[PDB]
Amino acid sequence: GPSVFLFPPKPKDTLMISRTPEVTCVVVDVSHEDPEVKFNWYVDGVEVHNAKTKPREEQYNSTYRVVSVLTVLHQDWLNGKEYKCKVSNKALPAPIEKTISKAKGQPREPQVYTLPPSRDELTKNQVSLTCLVKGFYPSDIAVEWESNGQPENNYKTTPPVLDSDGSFFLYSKLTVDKSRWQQGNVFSCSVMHEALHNHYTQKSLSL
Amino acid sequence: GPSVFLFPPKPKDTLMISRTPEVTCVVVDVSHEDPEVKFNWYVDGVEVHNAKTKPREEQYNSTYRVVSVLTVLHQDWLNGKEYKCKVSNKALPAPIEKTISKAKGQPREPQVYTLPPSRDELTKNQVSLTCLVKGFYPSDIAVEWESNGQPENNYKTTPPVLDSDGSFFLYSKLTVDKSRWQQGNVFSCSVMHEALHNHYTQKSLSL
Amino acid sequence: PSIDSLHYLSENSKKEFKEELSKAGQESQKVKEILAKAQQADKQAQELAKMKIPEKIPMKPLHGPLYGGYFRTWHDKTSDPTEKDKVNSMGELPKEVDLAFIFHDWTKDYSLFWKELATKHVPKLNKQGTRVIRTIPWRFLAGGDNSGIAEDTSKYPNTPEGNKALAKAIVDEYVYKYNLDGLDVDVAHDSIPKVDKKEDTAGVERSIQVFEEIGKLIGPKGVDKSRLFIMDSTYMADKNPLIERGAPYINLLLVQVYGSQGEKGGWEPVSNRPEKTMEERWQGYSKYIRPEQYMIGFSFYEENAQEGNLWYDINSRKDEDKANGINTDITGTRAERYARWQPKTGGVKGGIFSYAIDRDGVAHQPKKYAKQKEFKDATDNIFHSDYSVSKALKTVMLKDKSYDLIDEKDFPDKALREAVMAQVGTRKGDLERFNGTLRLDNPAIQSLEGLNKFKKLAQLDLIGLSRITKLDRSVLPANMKPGKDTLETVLETYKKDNKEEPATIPPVSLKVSGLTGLKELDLSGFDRETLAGLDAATLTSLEKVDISGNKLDLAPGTENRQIFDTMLSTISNHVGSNEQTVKFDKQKPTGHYPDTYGKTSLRLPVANEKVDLQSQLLFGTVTNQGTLINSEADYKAYQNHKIAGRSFVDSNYHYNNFKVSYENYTVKVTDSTLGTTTDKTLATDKEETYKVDFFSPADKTKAVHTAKVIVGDEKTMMVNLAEGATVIGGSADPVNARKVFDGQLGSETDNISLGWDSKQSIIFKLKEDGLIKHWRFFNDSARNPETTNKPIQEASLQIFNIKDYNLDNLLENPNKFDDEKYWITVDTYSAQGERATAFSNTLNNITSKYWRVVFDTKGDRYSSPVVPELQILGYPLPNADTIMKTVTTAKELSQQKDKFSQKMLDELKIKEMALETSLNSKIFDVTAINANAGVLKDCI
Ligand SMILES: *[C@@H]1O[C@H](CO)[C@@H](O[C@@H]2O[C@H](CO)[C@@H](O[C@@H]3O[C@H](CO)[C@@H](O)[C@H](O)[C@@H]3O)[C@H](O)[C@H]2NC(C)=O)[C@H](O)[C@H]1NC(C)=O
């Protein structure tokens, strides 16, 4: 029997109010015997027929992945509305239903702060400028780095981590030279987060 | 058929000798009325019969799961000895084997830098004292927050974000009252990790 | 139509309708329906106030095996007629249902169900004989968490008067409200009185008391015995807080273990055996209640049975009949076994019950399911049940000869018959199953005919039937002689590899007294052990007796032998004792081990021999009659034991047969060096004193005997100076490190790694003064004979060089004193490369109250010092500091061969010899040290 999995949009899209989140239901491990998949979308649990099926993607186990994508309202999604994928196939005793939503709870704004290396830290050769984004709810959030208004790539950003107070937290470290990170240069961490206030946050950095 | 999952001990448990490090291999997958389960666990390829199969702590109906927990000496886990449990039961075609150990790879000393709270963190009721620990291999490590020489429970950590040097990294933020943060009694980030001196370290903080 | 002006709606239902108000608090169209339904509910409520409830007519006493049932009120078509899937009616339950467990689950206040009970279903149940008992949760009756009426802590305090009020209100509301016929208590920990999921002791006791007062108002002990007192719980009795306090008040006890787990119990790997077995439960209740008082419940297949509840405990729907939610074949149903199921011990069951009684007739979902979520016919398809299955099963049980009533054809003596009924019961099956005490005190009993029928009886008191005249097996309970259970299981349990069950039947306790008219007493060939229970003084008319072939120790002098001598004297004074009138022989006494042994020491010379420890030391078999047999010759004296001039024992029980074995019992040797052995062989080639612990095969912790093997000269026992050590400065964690000094060897699980270094150190002071002569450290192999921790390749003991360093300074700055400059190396271990579970070495009368040792695996490459246990050896010696100071002073002066003359030197040599003897002695004698010190200070 085939299997169905419902994925949400990219975190930045659901994490900036300007963007349009969508739920796409891709069915994997779908055997030749029961290849047919019928899709029903649902916004906030209400069945919707605006899902759009993409061409199938064959898996490495000689199975196919078949996807139907339905657009959701960004604020609806961030508010915990349920995007639901109903998958129908001849191998199932009944249609399969799956539901997803934003993390429940009052959203908490991410506070984003970029700090340069500690004097002990900047004593290294490649000092890191770190933007910690904390107090963020629901955990759904996205962060990115930049320096002098230009994106900084020598950076790794951790996934949001649900804090002990129900919000989420994370850190992103942009590695520069301790010559450069402490050279003197303004970095800006730009965040678009469903957990961010106005689905955005900023972190300033300097030597 | 059933399936086995082996969970290493908490990095602190494996890092504080006052604790008793242990990996727990539990089987909860396909099972039957036949309850015989000859749980078998190995270490470095040598199977140890001895064990303490947890008394079923299930409160009431519908939890027929058996979990075995094997305590391991630090010098044995640490030496990267590979504990593999092969569990045989009549419902199973043959014993199922799964191995866990101290992670392979050159240990890498964490580099610790302290960051004081962001000003918004003091605008927050809870301000965050941050310890960034980077360049640590393997990813297993224990960090903790304390204040006034006394532990601070209002602390949160992050997953071991693989460093670009193959080690893992994270930031930890101890939260305290912004009034307490303003009158910050001496805090200490105490870390037990083999990559630490005396596999144990304290980082100071004060107002 | 406001909800505050409805009059007839209960304040609860009103609180509900106003919470429903808050939701959609202003929606124009839903504020209508909520008020229109609060209204229609008020119309129903007043229809509930004006009905004419049927008067409760007297109901015939419940007699014989019963069939009860818990009917899901949510599954009744009249509870809420709006739910059209429910089409069955509990009034359709057949007459084969002996007991009607009124379930109040999912019935509104305005619900038709109450009226349907009162006016239709309650009358019919009466007219058919079905009595209705309402069940409530312990939470319903205790606690405040959703305790309903019990929430009113003012209306019902946890006080005597408060409890009385709570009881009156509860009985009114749930029993008197409908003039109900019984009270049932759910005991499921879920139903247990809870508040924030926390035990309310006042709640528990107060519910005990309020049920007890209701049982003073209803039930067997109550004002209204017509109302019953039932008690059913999922919890095992030993966890029923109300078991103890409610037993005396309860009328009925119900218990349903529906499912394979309840039938067979669960499985524990720790004991590798079944747990929570049926017999365990019935026994637990027996600690509180009579098996007649016991009724068991099974489960029909309930609609929409989810995991857990979907027990399929009865026959399931056939796989082919995928749309057939009814399957009626009980043949091979686990419930079939239940209908046949009777508790192996104790007695006959009170009867049977059914959980989800409202599901009689509906099949269980086939196992080829539960992967489907939205598809379930047998489980989740609605059917209208005629309860036909319930009828079939109840009739099947009702046709069990096992429940046949005990009758006068069983006990011809109407006195004896009535007395049995009074003390045992009325079912014939009881007698085969009755496993209790039997007090027979009516002198009117002229004959014991039928007493043979008692198969399982626990005790039997014949306490005054003077009219009975002869006593033999035919009038002696079946349990009279020893035996094993003969009751075959009717339980279709899940035990498969555990397929043996003789269940040795303990021979019944036969108390006999006031059988004044008893003339013939035949207990021969009963394999009986003692005469206990026989009021020999009461068998005044005794004329014939035969007790041959018992298991009784008739060796002269026994209390058994005493009664036998009395009886023999009675016979020799009545008609003369002779080989015809009296028989006692063919005993096969079972030897038990003695409780204590007196040989606390075994002395042998120092020779290159070897000795079997147990044989020389572990010995003796005492009789339950106290007959101590301690040798083959002792058994030969038992062979020489004569009764009436000849033995009373079976000629076949050879001493071997007679002998009990102490093999498989272990030993723990312990030489004077606190070294230990476990060879029953012991070689006297070494002059040593060893301490021997006897362990049963059954226990290696509490010694059955302790002993002192002594090859050559006795040695003072050493002492674990390590016991009570004060942890001092060392690499090892002092908190953990004390564990090595912890006296106990410790478990395998316990950690024995001192420090994260091939060599790791630990200082520690000793508890008290002593004379130190040796030390020892356990390798992990002691903990587990097979450990991967490498052994200490080299180690060292040292003391703080207090002679050169101020011990006060050390105590002030222990970390500062972490230098061997502060220390004095005193001993050093060095492994030569042989496997060993521990190392030990003597000590030259060491003195430092503080010590500091390092161990060393010498394993460089991340091999850390791990030491199992720390052993410091010596004797207790007060004033060790001062005495050892005197000893070193004596050493120094004895070196000062220029300072003292030969005449002083001779006394000094005598004194030094004394100190030498004193170095390892147990009684500290500082006097000689002081006298020598005075002589020396005079000489200085
Ligand atoms: C765990 O085992 C029990 C016993 O086999 C399962 O049976 C019974 O399930 C019903 C329906 O869920 C429970 O009834 C409700 O319980 C609440 C407790 O607050 C009570 O207020 C309601 O009036 C109603 O009776 C019942 O407690 C439960 N136990 C018994 C002895 O009947 C139970 O369902 C199993 N667990 C789950 C989650 O299903």
Q: Residue A90's domain is classified under what CATH number?
A: 2.60.40.10
Amino acid at C593: Y
Together in a domain, C422 and C512: yes
On whether residue A105 sits in a domain, the answer given is no
CA distance A40 to A26: 12
- Domain residues for B148? 111-205
On whether residue B12 sits in a domain, the answer given is yes
CA distance C281 to C257: 10
On whether residue A106 sits in a domain, the answer given is no
Residue C919 gets the label, from left (phi > 0), alpha (psi -120 to 50) or beta, of alpha
The answer to whether B20 contacts C788, with C-beta atoms less than 8 Å apart, is: no
Find the helix or strand (DSSP H, E) in which C232 lies: strand C228-232
Ligand 1 atom nearest B62 alpha carbon: 1
Q: Are the C-beta atoms of residues C833 and C742 closer than 8 Å to each other? A: no
Together in a domain, B88 and B32: yes
CATH no. for residue C858?
2.60.120.260
Q: Tell me the count of B-C CB pairs closer than 8 A.
A: 62
Together in a domain, C780 and C895: no
C375 touching B (Cβ < 8 Å) = no
- Could you give the number of structural domains in chain B? 2
Together in a domain, B126 and B84: no
How far CA C110 is from CA of B117, C44, C47, in Å, comes to 61, 5, 8
**Spacing of C-alpha B151 from chain mean position:** 18
The rounded Å distance from CA C48 to ligand 1 centre is 28
Q: Tell me the count of A-B CB pairs closer than 8 A.
A: 70
Full 3-state SS string of chain B: CCCEEEECCCHHHHHCCCCCCEEEEEECCCCCCCCCCECCEEECCEEECCCCCCCCCCCCCCCCCEEEEEECCHHHHCCCCCEEEEEECCCCCCCEEEEECCCCCCCECCEEEEECCCHHHHHCCEEEEEEEEEEEECCCCEEEEEECCEECCCEECCCCEECCCCCEEEEEEEEEEHHHHHCCCCEEEEEECCCCHHHEEEEEECC
Which of C525, C546, C567 terminates a domain? The answer is C546
The nearest CA of chain C is from the CA of A95 a distance in Å of 8
Ligand 1 atom nearest C140 alpha carbon: 21
Together in a domain, C864 and C906: no
**In this structure, is the dihedral angle defined by the CA atoms of residues C192, C193, C198 and C204, taken in order, positive or negative?**
negative
The nearest CA of chain C is from the CA of A28 a distance in Å of 18
Which residues touch C409 (CB under 8 Å, ≥6 apart)?
none
Together in a domain, B56 and B13: yes
Together in a domain, B171 and B133: yes
**Between the CA atoms of B43, B47, B49 and B54, what dihedral angle is there, to the nearest 10 degrees?**
50
The rounded Å distance from CA B157 to ligand 1 centre is 40
Together in a domain, C760 and C830: yes
Give the mutation candidate from B126, B161, B176 for the A interface (greatest A CB count, under 10 A): B161
Together in a domain, B96 and B10: yes
Reported structure resolution in angstroms: 4.6
Together in a domain, B94 and B117: no
Find the helix or strand (DSSP H, E) in which C562 lies: helix C559-574
Together in a domain, A7 and A96: yes
CA distance C668 to C283: 39
On whether residue B76 sits in a domain, the answer given is yes
Compute chain C's Rg from CA coordinates. 40
The answer to whether B73 contacts C862, with C-beta atoms less than 8 Å apart, is: no
Other C-beta atoms lying within 10 Å of the C-beta of residue C852:
28
Pocket of ligand 1 (CB under 6 A): B 60-61; C 105, 137, 188, 190, 234, 308-309
- Domain residues for C277? 59-129+260-402
The answer to whether A113 contacts B121, with C-beta atoms less than 8 Å apart, is: yes
Together in a domain, A59 and A140: no
On whether residue B105 sits in a domain, the answer given is no
On whether residue C347 sits in a domain, the answer given is yes
Together in a domain, A124 and A44: no
The answer to whether B161 contacts A163, with C-beta atoms less than 8 Å apart, is: no
Together in a domain, C863 and C727: yes
- Helix, coil or strand: residue A62: coil
Together in a domain, C840 and C910: no
Which of C677, C711, C745 terminates a domain? The answer is C711
Ligand 1 atom nearest C105 alpha carbon: 23
Which residue in chain B is spatially nearest to C739 when comparing CA positions? B18
The nearest CA of chain C is from the CA of B103 a distance in Å of 16
Taking alpha carbons only, the member of A83, A79, A60, A57 closest to residue A140 is: A79
Which residues pair with residue B143 across a beta bridge?
A: B191
Which of A100, A133, A148 terminates a domain? The answer is A100
At CB < 8 Å, which residues of chain A contact B? 111, 113, 115, 117-118, 120-121, 124, 128, 130, 132, 134-135, 154, 156, 158-159, 161, 163-165, 169-171, 173, 175
Minimal Cβ distance to B120: which of A113, A169, A175: A113
Together in a domain, A10 and A96: yes
Q: Are the C-beta atoms of residues A140 and A13 closer than 8 Å to each other? A: no
CB burial of residue C657 (10 Å; 0-12, 13-18, 19+): exposed
- Helix, coil or strand: residue A112: strand
The answer to whether C753 contacts B74, with C-beta atoms less than 8 Å apart, is: yes
- Could you give the number of structural domains in chain C? 7
CA distance A102 to A110: 16
Taking alpha carbons only, the member of B50, B2, B53, B62 closest to residue B24 is: B53
Which of A81, A100, A119 terminates a domain? The answer is A100
Contacting residues of A for C375, CB less than 8 Å apart: 93-94
On whether residue B133 sits in a domain, the answer given is yes
C309, C310, C353, C354: which to mutate for ligand 1, most atoms within 8 A of CB?
A: C309
Q: Are the C-beta atoms of residues C274 and C267 closer than 8 Å to each other? A: yes
The rounded Å distance from CA C246 to ligand 1 centre is 23
Which residues pair with residue C669 across a beta bridge?
A: C677
Together in a domain, B199 and B174: yes
Which residue in chain C is spatially nearest to B67 when comparing CA positions? C269
Together in a domain, A96 and A9: yes
The rounded Å distance from CA B205 to ligand 1 centre is 54
Following DSSP, what letter does each residue of C316-374 receive, concatenated? Answer: BPPSS-TT--B----TT-HHHHHHH---SSSS---EEEEESGGGTTBPBPPSS-SS-SS
On whether residue C907 sits in a domain, the answer given is yes
Segments of A137-205 assigned E as strands: 143-144, 155-157, 161-162, 168-175, 187-191, 201-205
On whether residue B37 sits in a domain, the answer given is yes
The nearest CA of chain B is from the CA of A52 a distance in Å of 36
On whether residue B17 sits in a domain, the answer given is yes
CA distance A88 to A74: 27
Which of A43, A68, A100 terminates a domain? The answer is A100
- b/e map C665-694, b = 16+ CB within 10 Å: bbbbbbbbbbbebeebebebeeebbbbbbb
Together in a domain, C408 and C535: yes
Find the helix or strand (DSSP H, E) in which C614 lies: helix C613-617
